[PDB]
Structures are given as structure tokens and as C-alpha cells.
Amino acid sequence: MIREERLLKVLRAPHVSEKASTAMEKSNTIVLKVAKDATKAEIKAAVQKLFEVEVEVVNTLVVKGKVKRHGQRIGRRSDWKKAYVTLKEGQNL
Amino acid sequence: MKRTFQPSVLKRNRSHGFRARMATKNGRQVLARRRAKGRARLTVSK
Amino acid sequence: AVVKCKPTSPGRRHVVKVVNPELHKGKPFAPLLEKNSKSGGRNNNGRITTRHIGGGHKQAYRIVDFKRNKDGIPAVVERLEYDPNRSANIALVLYKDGERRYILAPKGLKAGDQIQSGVDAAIKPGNTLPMRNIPVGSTVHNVEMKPGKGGQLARSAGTYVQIVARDGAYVTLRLRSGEMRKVEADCRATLGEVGNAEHMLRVLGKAGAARWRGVRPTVRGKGKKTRSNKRTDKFIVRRRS
RNA sequence: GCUCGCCGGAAGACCAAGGGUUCCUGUCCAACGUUAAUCGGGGCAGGGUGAGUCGACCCCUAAGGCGAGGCCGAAAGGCGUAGUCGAUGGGAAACAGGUUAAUAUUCCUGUACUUGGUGUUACUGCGAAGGGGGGACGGAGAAGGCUAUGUUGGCCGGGCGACGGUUGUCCCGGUUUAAGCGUGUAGGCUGGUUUUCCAGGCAAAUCCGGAAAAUCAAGGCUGAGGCGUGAUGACGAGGCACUACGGUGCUGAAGCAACAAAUGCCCUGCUUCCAGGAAAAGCCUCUAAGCAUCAGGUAACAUCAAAUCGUACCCCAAACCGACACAGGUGGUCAGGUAGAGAAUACCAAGGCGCUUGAGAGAACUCGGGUGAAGGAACUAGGCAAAAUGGUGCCGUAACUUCGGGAGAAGGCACGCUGAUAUGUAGGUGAGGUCCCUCGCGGAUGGAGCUGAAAUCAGUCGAAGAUACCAGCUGGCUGCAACUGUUUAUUAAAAACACAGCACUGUGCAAACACGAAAGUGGACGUAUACGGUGUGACGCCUGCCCGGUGCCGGAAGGUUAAU
RNA sequence: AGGACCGAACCGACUAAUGUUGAAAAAUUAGCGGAUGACUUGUGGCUGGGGGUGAAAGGCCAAUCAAACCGGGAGAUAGCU
């Protein structure tokens, strides 16, 4: 299945927010914006082989893009997936 | 009083869906002429 | 047996009920239920071709055999059932070998009776055998015009046909309509006569009877025979009088 | 922050279709709000939807669609086999509380549950596009129990009342706790155990069915609820310490009994009934070729996985359809208290709102109502509109009639509170104990506490005692129509329509007729007591005479007659 | 049981009024019938215009119908304005 290029490319970047900080300080959970497909197994493998930290359970959700119409010009945001990763053992950023 | 227009995605896509239109040769000609005209949306965007 | 309901109120004020206690009460033989339920009286194109029809209460279809190919295997009649599809009542025959089937119940057939088909069957009502061995002058029901089908004539309630003579390979039959016809003798025949003959006694009580029987109301908008076959003239002797 | 008012079987809350970010935060008032708009469903920037246990998705399915081959049609084109799509149904599994400004049964503590793969333990007949078991089904009725729910008693902790009394039979808030596990009761269903044989279940079959026998009549199946675990847990008012006044940590006792009761369950059940009320998949038996030390299956053991999609927001409205922030329409579920027959009506519990222009003036006139001395349809084409009774139980109730009805005919009798019968009556609900007892989800028992209907007498208050809302005016004559019902959406809701019944006529199965150029289809997987067409329209007395002409039937010595 | 009565939800508005450049291109006020079936409704499909369907009004087929809409014949023709 690895093919580590797929694991490298699956995840886009972490997400910073008040809810993300609360989750990190409560359950050591990491919120990551990932690729479109971003399958659970792929993200699990990417986290395991990239951050060198065990993952307990992975939760994923899709965030719909907003609309920023500029006046007779409707502009819709792109589509990205948000994934929650719980380590339970890695005390890292 | 109940209005004539009752929105229904299933009904709309079953009566004027892309596959339903393409199934009959008449719908194929309709699609071809709509493309020739240059309509942004041929039948519907789901 | 007919019971006249008292005139409690219009709409079943003057109804006539044709009830028969001996008929079995309960669910039918489930393994013999299939499709061909109420079709709504609509053709493939969906046009109105048989006007004044539609709706009707849901009714399952029971497969009923008429060929009676089971010969030499006596069967015992267990119970009688009312088939909604056909006016005539049916009876559940269990063969000695374990086959359970439905056969139109004649008037002389009651629960707990033995029926045997074949050319060697005794000459009594309820048996089935080719009409070649049927003595002339005995009334028959559920007659077969062509071998292999089984009972294409006289299947409605209280229908009988009287044999007048054989006159060669063919046999002359007198239909209830009052016409003489020539039929191949090799066809299978069923002895006895069909059961309950009180179909006309019931008056359906009110509109709802016919309405849920599948007959839609008729809306208002003579001596001209439309028979044009020119193929069965030799088979038929004379028309009805 | 408080007062007053409305809804509260909604104007409340939760879901699916509906719109697709309007949801929360900080920021701005040009336009958007029928008014000013710091506010907002208006603009800008950021955040928000966490699933093996929700649903979709997905194996196989109804109506219906496509349709390999094939048939038909000059071609587009029509039907249709196998096959394949197609829910509005059928198939596996989760709850207590908390969490953020916005999300949860998705995250946190726990009990747990369904399915597949991987390797091991010991055993062995496994293997179907096939049979069977049930899946698997209609209208109405009901009694007996339980549950949510509500009431009362004790108990827990605080109270002695802005003003006449309020240490007591007084008030305040609570007296809440799941899925699973074993018990398998109430109730319902079935007659079972063993052996031999068989024209059947497309060949076969230990499986189904049938035929014989020996034996018991006590064995099996289904089955709410309650019981202990779940849970020495969760919640718990109210308090004890720290506050950015938004909040955080700790503590914590009662948390038990009785009553009534559902549209919820026992019940896909029992009785009756004609209108006779589907299919397959979800589990198991066996057999076909094959494998028969093999491969597979059996119960357990340790482990892996159960992908993907919406999880915000209103969902009887400001967000959906009506061009609007529109007096309109929108399916399913939750269904509390007071009195009452109720899911109508009157006021309240939790919850949502005072509805997007306000204040004055207090004229005619317009719109909906309150009362009106006397008359009471006399106005009006017109009892049109309004006005009046309106219920309970008892007496009483005419003509006719198909004996059902008329009828609730008409007309009268009492309706509040308190005591007595009876400190709360009969009924119901029902604690402990005597005797035995498979000995506990037992009984002949005997009363603990409560609803307590309905009736007589007495005393008493007011003109009115169903005193609120809700809630038929009554009878006769008379023409029409069997009654109930259906259309003129948007001038005529009927004296029109059909209607159950009756009469005539046609149809012999490849039936008649229509859709169709034509396959084929409905009739009908029906068979003259069946079906098609026309007339009338229950029931009682009858349907009397006539074939000039038009169709129709049977057909004739004969006159006429095209195609050829 | 009663195509039963009284009567909620629900079902077409029948009756007088409001509105007639309305809140609504058909709703509301107060009475009126059914309210266990000839009953009603959600979800999908079928019947496509010289035809469909119609318990029959020559009703409805997208706020329209004694023959809907779209593009074309077609700038139809007009002894008419």
C-alpha cells in the first residue's frame, strides 16, 4: 500500500482554531485539512509513518465551501476534508 | 391553497435528467441544439 | 342458502347474502399464491379499452389445474374454498402421493370424498376421464374443447352441458346458451356438475359491492350479430336460439 | 432585571422532502427591514457538522422502466425472454450525564451488541441459479396485565411570612436512573417421541409430504412486564472554597410505597366477516458434478477490519411553494395539570411570542360587535342576515311504515355548597399472616392505605345553580329524487350525474370490442349464473294495440348489379 | 357490521358579509355535510393534444382549453382599422 508518496500527498496541513486548541488541550486531538478523498486508512498510515506516533481512532468530515459574492459575481469556495486524529500517547505539538 | 409547483429533486432528475434525456433520440437532439446555442447548464446541476 | 337482511337502513336495506357455512374459513394454501392480481383493466399502452372497470379490492390468484393429467392416483378432498377470481368454489384435493391442488367443486362433492381420474375411473360425479368413454345422455361440466387444456367450457356457477349423440369421431354437445357444437372426443371431461348455483340470488346490496369488486360506474352516452369467424363453421352446428 | 397579555393536540420540540451555509463570533449602516436601525435571515473576516451501533449506502424484491437473443414495422420506431434497474416496505448492532459561542446516540467514564477475515484447540460429510419451515401481509370488536405519564403519604434541606392566624392534617424543590445479562411469569400457539415403506417436491435426497405401526398424553414454540446485576456508579437541591462576574474545584441526604392510566406493548394474537386481503432476500436441512487423510463445516481461543456519503440552520415558516419578512398550503413523532365523554372548548406547567411604522384627536361616514321601553317579518322578491333553545338522568311521545324508522318527535320533571344514610356507600385497587408447598415470577385465606360513581332527607346562598366557553329552534302541508355521494377549480353543488336493482341485445375462446399500419396487450391467466353495448333506475299495481318508413333478425319464385 | 346518527383532526366550499388597483391573480369571519369508507393522504410509475382522461361539466392536461407550449412553414391571408 506504500507507496509513501500517497501518504505524503494525502494530508494538506493542520488547522488552527479555538476549537482545535481546546481539543488539543483536552484529548490531545489534531485537526488536519486533507485531500479530497483522504481515506481513513490512508490518513492513518500517513500519520503513523510521518509523525511516528500511534493513532487511536481517526474521524473525518467534509466542510462545504462558503460564498463570497463580490457583486454580480458569485464566488464559491473549494471543498476540503477535516480529519480528527487522536494519539493518546504522543505529547507533541 | 396548494400551489402548482412542488419542488422534488427526484422527480426533476427522473423527468429531465441527463440520462433520461439521452435515452431517447429526441432528447439527444435537444442536448445537441442546446450545446450549439451555448447554454451554461444543459439540463440541471445536481 | 340465502339470508335476507332486514331493512335496517338504505344501502344494504334489501341486500341478499349467499352464505355457505361448510366453506372453509381462514387463509388459503400459501404455497399456491402468485401474481396476476388486480391489473386495473388497462392494456400495455394504458388506454381505456374495457370501460367501466377499475379499482377493486386486492385479490390474490390461486393456480387451479384443469388438465387432470394425474391418472390412476386417487385423491381425498379436504376442504372447500371460495376463489375471489371465479364465482365457482374450489376444493383442496390431496393425492395419495402427497400432491395438494385445487379443483372446481361440483354440487355432489363434499368434504371427505375420493376422486380418481383416468379411463378406468368409476362413473360418478367428480371423476374425470375422456368423453370417448362417457355414456351418451349424461350431463357434464368443465368440458375441454381441445386436449391438453382442461375444462374450457362450463366453468361458471351452475353451468352444465347435455350430450345428445356422438355421430362418429366427434361428439355433439349442447351448450347452456342453446347451441349444438361438434367437439373432438379425445378431449378430457369431468363428471358431475358445478357446485353452488345461487349466483343470481345475491343483489350486491349497495353500490360499494360492485365498487370494490372492480367495476366502475357506468355512464350513459341491438340485434346486430357481430360474429365473423369463418373458421369454426364446420365445428359448430347451429347458433343459439 | 421586573410587571401585563397570547399560544401552550401550538404560535412548542424533534425528523424526511424542501433552500444549500441564512448557524456562532468581531466588525460597518450606503441600499435591504413598507418608518430612524448601533440590531437582523443586509456586507466584510474567522469558526462550526467527528459514525460498524443515526440514516443513506448496500445483497435480493412490488407497481413501473431498459432490454442481449427474437418478432413486427419503408427508416426513426413498438412489444417482449433471460438479464438488469426500480421503495413508498422487507435484512446487523448504543444508552445515562457532560462538553463548545455553533456539533453528538459521532468526543469523554462504563456496561455492552451485530458481521467478515486471519492462525490454533478437538470433532466431522461439505458442496446449489432447488425444495421446504416462517418469512408472508385484509375490515371491525373487545376484554386482562404492564409501561411512559400524572396524583397522594412518608422522607430529604429551608421557612414562621411586608397585613387579620400560620411549630402544623402548613408552604417551598426533589423523591430520576438506560442497552445488555439470567430468571421466562401474565398471555397466546401447537398434540408429541421411536421405527418401516412410498407413482410426489423437474433426476435424487436423512429435508418436506403421504401410508403403516409401538409409546406418552406431558413435551415443545412464542411471549409484554417485574425481579438482582447493570449501578458502592450517573443525577441531586442546597451548601463549603477560589472569580477576568463569564465562571472553576469539593461536598452532598432522601431518593421509597399506594392510586388512575394511555392512541404504547403483550397482539403479525382471539371472535366474526365477505370485499378472501403480494414477491423475494435475512437463518437451517438435504441432496447434483466435485472433493471423499485433502478442501470445507462445527463450539471456543488471540487478533484485524466494517470503506463512502448529510450530521449547522426554519421545517405547520421571515429560510419550502405562492414575484414579498404574504391573514394561504405542507407529511410523521412527543400528546402534562385543573373540570369535563374527548386530540373540541376555558385557564395554567416546560417552551415560543406581543406579530417591523408610533403618538395624539375622540367628528360625519365605513367594518365587527354590547344593550335597547312597545310591537316581532308587519322592511325586503325572499325568516337572507340576525335573534332564541342547546347537556345530563327520569316520565312521556301521534299519523304512516318495507316494522328498521318516524323520535332526541311534541310536552314536562331535578341540576350549586355542607351533614346524615356512609368521620368516604357498592364496585375496584389491593400490604402482612395461618397450611402445606415443586418450596417460589404459588395458592382456600384477610385486611392495611386510596378513586370512590349513583340515590333520599335535612340546613343554607342568590332573580337566575349545564349559571364560563362549547352546545339541535319546533310541527304540519306540498312537487321533486330509492337513500349516501359526484362535476360546472374561478357566475348555476341541483329538479344534472351516476347509484344497488330491472329489461333488451351481442360474444363459443385465437370469443366480441379498443389500443394499434403491425408484433402484442386489456377483456381474462375469466369461460354463457362469464363478459361487451343501449334504456330505466329500490318497493307495490301494469308495460295495452300498430311494421307506414328507418336500422335488426330469418331469406325467397323471381327483376337489377361491378370487378373478371 | 351498520356505504347510521351527534361530533374533533382531515376533506370541495354551500350560505350572508369583508376584500373587487386584497394579506391572497379565490383567502377570512359566523353557520352548513361527511368524519369506517363510493373516505382521505404521502411516496414512485403509467394514460401526451384531432389525443389523454372524465360517477359527464364538451370539466382538467402547469394561474389558459369548444382543441396547451415551444421553433418552423410564415413578414400565413385580409375587399377591415
Swiss-Prot record, chain A:
Keyword list (alphabetical) reads: Ribonucleoprotein, Ribosomal protein, RNA-binding, rRNA-binding
Question: A single Pfam family, by name?
Answer: Ribosomal_L23
BP-aspect Gene Ontology terms: cytoplasmic translation; ribosomal large subunit assembly
What's the superkingdom here? Bacteria
Q: Which cysteines are joined by disulfide bonds?
A: none
Q: Where is the signal peptide?
A: none
**InterPro entries from the UniProt entry:** Nucleotide-bd_a/b_plait_sf, Ribosomal_uL23-like, Ribosomal_uL23/eL15/eS24_sf, Ribosomal_uL23_CS
Q: Which GO terms describe its molecular function?
A: rRNA binding; structural constituent of ribosome
- One CC-aspect GO term: cytosolic large ribosomal subunit
This protein's assembly is summarised as:
Part of the 50S ribosomal subunit. Contacts protein L29 and trigger factor. Might also contact SecE and probably does contact SecG and SecY when the SecYEG translocation complex is docked with the ribosome.
Function, as annotated: One of the early assembly proteins, it binds 23S rRNA; is essential for growth. One of the proteins that surround the polypeptide exit tunnel on the outside of the subunit. Acts as the docking site for trigger factor for Ffh binding to the ribosome (SRP54) and to nascent polypeptide chains.
Q: What family does this chain come from, according to its entry?
A: Belongs to the universal ribosomal protein uL23 family.
Please identify the protein, giving its name as recorded. Large ribosomal subunit protein uL23
Q: Show the taxonomic lineage.
A: Bacteria, Pseudomonadati, Pseudomonadota, Gammaproteobacteria, Enterobacterales
From Swiss-Prot, chain B:
Domain of life assignment? Bacteria
Task: Look up keyword Ribosomal protein and say if it applies.
Answer: yes
Gene3D superfamilies attached to this UniProt entry: 1.10.287.3980
Pfam families assigned: Ribosomal_L34
Kindly list the residue ranges recorded as spanning the membrane. Answer: none
Asked if Chaperone is a keyword of the record, the answer is: no
Gene Ontology MF: a single term: structural constituent of ribosome
Q: Which UniProt keywords apply?
A: Ribonucleoprotein, Ribosomal protein
What InterPro entries is this protein classified in? Ribosomal_bL34, Ribosomal_bL34_CS
One GO biological process this protein is involved in is:
cytoplasmic translation
- GO CC terms for this protein? cytoplasm; cytosolic large ribosomal subunit
Which family is this protein grouped under? Belongs to the bacterial ribosomal protein bL34 family.
Q: Subunit notes for this chain? A: Part of the 50S ribosomal subunit.
What protein name applies here?
Large ribosomal subunit protein bL34
Classification from the root reads:
Bacteria, Pseudomonadati, Pseudomonadota, Gammaproteobacteria, Enterobacterales
Swiss-Prot record, chain C:
- Report whether rRNA-binding shows up as a keyword of the record: yes
InterPro entries to which the protein is assigned, alphabetical: NA-bd_OB-fold (IPR012340), Rib_uL2_dom2 (IPR014722), Ribosomal_uL2 (IPR002171), Ribosomal_uL2_bac/org-type (IPR005880), Ribosomal_uL2_C (IPR022669), Ribosomal_uL2_CS (IPR022671), Ribosomal_uL2_dom3 (IPR014726), Ribosomal_uL2_RNA-bd_dom (IPR022666)
Which of UniProt's keywords are assigned here? Acetylation, Ribonucleoprotein, Ribosomal protein, RNA-binding, rRNA-binding
Q: Name one GO molecular function term.
A: RNA binding
Ribosomal protein as UniProt keyword: yes
One GO cellular component, as annotated: cytosolic large ribosomal subunit
Which region ranges are annotated with the description Disordered? 27-52
Gene3D superfamilies hit by this protein: 2.30.30.30, Nucleic acid-binding proteins, Ribosomal protein L2, domain 3
Which stretches are tagged as biased composition: Low complexity? 38-47
Function description? One of the primary rRNA binding proteins. Located near the base of the L1 stalk, it is probably also mobile. Required for association of the 30S and 50S subunits to form the 70S ribosome, for tRNA binding and peptide bond formation. It has been suggested to have peptidyltransferase activity; this is highly controversial. In the E.coli 70S ribosome in the initiation state it has been modeled to make several contacts with the 16S rRNA (forming bridge B7b, PubMed:12809609); these contacts are broken in the model with bound EF-G.
Do you know which NCBIfam families this protein is assigned to?
rplB_bact
Q: What family does this belong to?
A: Belongs to the universal ribosomal protein uL2 family.
- Self-association or partners: how does it assemble? Part of the 50S ribosomal subunit. Forms a bridge to the 30S subunit in the 70S ribosome, contacting the 16S rRNA. Interacts weakly with S6 in one of the 3.5 A resolved structures. In pull-down experiments interacts with CedA.
Q: What else is known?
A: This protein can be partially replaced in vivo by its H.marismortui (HmaL2) or human (L8, from the 60S cytoplasmic ribosome) homolog.
Q: Which HAMAP family match?
A: Ribosomal_uL2_B
- Name of this protein: Large ribosomal subunit protein uL2
| Species for this entry | Escherichia coli (strain K12)
